[PDB]
């Protein structure tokens, strides 16, 4: 029974590609809830929105709302069912919608931020669409860099000092922190791994956390340990640098390292312990990364909430290499790494 | 009588190829003058010219400098003589100077400023090329890339400290607009459209909106209808952000979007009823990214002028669609949209 | 026994590919240090060693750890060999490690630096890597954009504030400077010329420019003309815009100008009398940008290195001509320009 919900549920596809419209629209909905964390799961996804809830019910009404309506507006732009149907459509949206009520300085339940969100999720496809027309001649796909863009024009937009829906200010750092390295607390540091993992979607609840690491684990068990080892990468990156504890700790060090580890671990690269040990180099990078890129969005007043990650993995996945156990997964075989691993091991013997 | 001004004016460029060359190149400065608009017609530009002489005319000879100094350039480095003939090589010079006297904050005619213009100018045809050679094989034109690319290059390297050729302060919004919404005007909103249509050049005169509307008429009605629905759906996303009436009021959210409804209703996509959709949908897309640029570049102290227009057309293009009905025109078939559509049509029932 | 070691030395490589491997890798770090300059030189890397001794021991230190950590990192990352022994895997991070001294707010001989730079150098290949598969197929090198982006992600996550590895503090200009043109030395003028061309490695010194000019020589007088004229056409620019006197003495204006004259005198281009005097013209380009984007980046916090030589050159290589006599070069047949126009009149014959 427990196989039935493991991997990318194609079983369940297959059922519900004979049952009424809703039904499936509700997969593709959930299914885009997953996509988030390069997951096709539908269980997965409701396992997500569970974490959401948790963390908060109007970050997850938001998200939802977001989802739905980029699924809606590509099935009417008429773009590929077969992404549509894969969730492909939905979890830049779902982003957009739960990172537009993280950063509202407005208040929980401001229900006329509902029009900017589904504004700004009409123009997910767009973007999905495009970018994709422009990286799939490279094989290369796009991670996150449609909400990305969408949440950067938004924040733009609206700002601080907007009179119907003012953003959260982001401010540069003025004065060189005073950092107590003897107040440093090995369980806080171990909570800011699974609150790594949940500030991929904004929430800072090590129980919201708990809920997407184990989402995750339901689909594919070597990307929640990707997912895991991204996270306490970004830990000890953040230390390196000397970032002030309570950053670390909220876990704003460890979400883009987490996804480029995912990623890179076995998703779009096969995994072999070469693969594994460059997830590692990437997950790194991308922590560095994520740092210079928030020091320099906060002099727009912008936050860089995951174009480290799109950037970083973007260039770890162009970069060629001459060694055959590092193998660049083709975009119309990447299922998850377990799946990827089999294939690259047939591809390797013939 | 009236045909004979009517669209491209093919009939006058057949009898101008066997003129002397000094009456040729009058209208290809003429034809990159109206070009800002996607006009290819020297009569369009003679009425653009007397608009800008009607609001500034230090701005009009700054304007037909910079486009004298970008043709004579473009044949020096050896460039495509059909594409000269066309004004391509001309228009974003003219944008070039237009607004470097508008960014100026030296008075008008400060003769210096003549100087940094040509200057300016003859690296225009350079970016037309480039730009060009890497747009032309995803079959994209280059909108206004090189006019964009310049000013910024200008803008920064001068600023507003220059003891030479000083710029005009550009400062970030740093407290909340006081918006009397018992003050908004009807007779101003309306004025908004040509104003919006005017800025297009950097032009606040109404009258000056008005000539370019009554020149963009000339070639093309369909033109003429996208430029003012363009500005009204600038008008409209400013209200919906809460923007001072004063930008509403002055085009400064018009402009963009008047530009993008031109370019997506009829001129780079065949016009049907989808496509007159999507362009006012690329419209309102275009004046929020254009609010959201605004903000962004404020912080570096320069102006997104016509940057939000450019990326969003390009973003709206390189969208693919599963839709018949959204077509996008061949990069070698693009005249205007009167004859675009019976270039579709004819397609369709082949 | 002079041409010996003119050019490329192709005659050193033949004999040392049947030597012991760590003489190789000495020829690799040697041939690494001069490529920043566009040389493949071992003895104009020792010249530019002795320079940057000459200068500051410890950032000739610093840049020569960066070269061999990039050097090992491309050997395990299985590289290409060929591009190994030539030096083009260990220049970037030549320039990052001395920059990163450069730029450096803790003194010299801190040595826990080290640990950044050969952090920030083992990202360098992996850039040199991705932007190369990106590049290659527009026939375009990769000339400094792995160091640029390496620079600027290290400064970006560290800044001024950073309690280990503080950086200098960017400030952008807030007050028009008070320049007294009755000060201008000719002298001073003079010798801005060599520190310009030394400020190519972040170096002041004009004897560090002058063994640079020296070294430079030694492969190729062109290139050394033109290094020359391009740091005079900085110089002229600067002048142009009332740049401080200070600054134009410093050579901050006319290292990109040196190094775009350079590649686009004879190196990437054939040499003709037109690609002279478009390389001057790109030279005083890239003096304009870089002033641009000096003042940019200065609003987020960061220098504009080399991004101003970077994108200029990329600007002029990607714009075509329909003239004969403005030849691009392959990119498998640039050597240095004597070689190069021997190739080109070759090809034009036939």
Redesign the interface.
């Given at each position: 029974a427990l196989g039935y919900v493991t991997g990318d549920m194609k079983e369940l596809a297959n059922q519900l590609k004979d049952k009424p419209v809703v039904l499936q629209f509700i997969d593709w909905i959930l299914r885009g809830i997953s996509q988030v964390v390069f997951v096709n799961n539908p269980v997965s996804g409701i396992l997500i929105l569970v974490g959401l809830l948790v963390q908060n019910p109007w970050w997850a009404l938001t998200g939802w709302l977001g989802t739905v309506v980029s699924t809606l507006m590509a099935l009417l732009?008429?773009?590929?069912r077969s992404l549509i149907a894969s969730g492909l459509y939905g979890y830049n949206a779902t982003l957009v919608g739960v990172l537009m009520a993280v950063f509202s300085d407005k208040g929980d339940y401001f229900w006329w931020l509902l029009l900017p969100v589904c504004?700004m999720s009409?123009?997910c496809p767009?973007?999905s669409?495009?970018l994709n027309?422009?990286l799939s001649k490279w094989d290369l796909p796009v991670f996150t860099l449609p909400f990305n863009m969408a949440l950067?024009?938004?924040l733009?937009?609206?700002?601080h000092?907007?009179?119907?829906?003012?953003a959260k200010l982001v401010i540069?750092?003025?004065?060189?922190?005073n950092?107590s390295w003897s107040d440093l607390s090995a369980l806080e540091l171990l909570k800011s791994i699974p609150v790594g993992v949940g500030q991929i979607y904004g929430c800072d609840n090590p129980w919201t956390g708990g809920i997407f690491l184990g989402d995750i684990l339901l689909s594919s068990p070597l990307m929640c340990l990707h997912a895991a080892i991204g996270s306490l990468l970004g830990i000890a990156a953040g230390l390196?640098?000397?970032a002030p504890f309570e950053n670390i700790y909220f876990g704003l060090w460890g979400f883009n390292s987490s996804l480029a580890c995912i990623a890179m671990g076995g998703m779009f690269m096969a995994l072999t312990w070469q693969t594994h040990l460059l997830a590692l180099?990437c997950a790194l990078?991308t922590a560095?990364?994520g740092?210079?890129?928030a020091?320099?969005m906060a002099?727009?007043?912008?936050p860089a909430c995951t174009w480290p990650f799109c950037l970083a993995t973007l260039?770890?996945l162009?970069?060629?290499?001459?060694?055959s156990n590092?193998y660049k997964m083709p975009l119309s075989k990447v299922t998850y790494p377990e799946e990827n691993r089999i294939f690259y091991l047939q591809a390797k013997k013939r």
């Open positions: 732009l008429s773009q590929d504004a009409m123009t767009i973007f669409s495009a027309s422009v950067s024009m938004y733009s937009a609206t700002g000092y907007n009179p119907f829906f003012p540069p750092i003025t004065t060189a922190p950092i390196s640098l000397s180099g990078f560095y990364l740092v210079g890129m020091n320099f002099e727009v007043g912008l260039l770890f162009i970069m060629t290499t001459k060694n590092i």
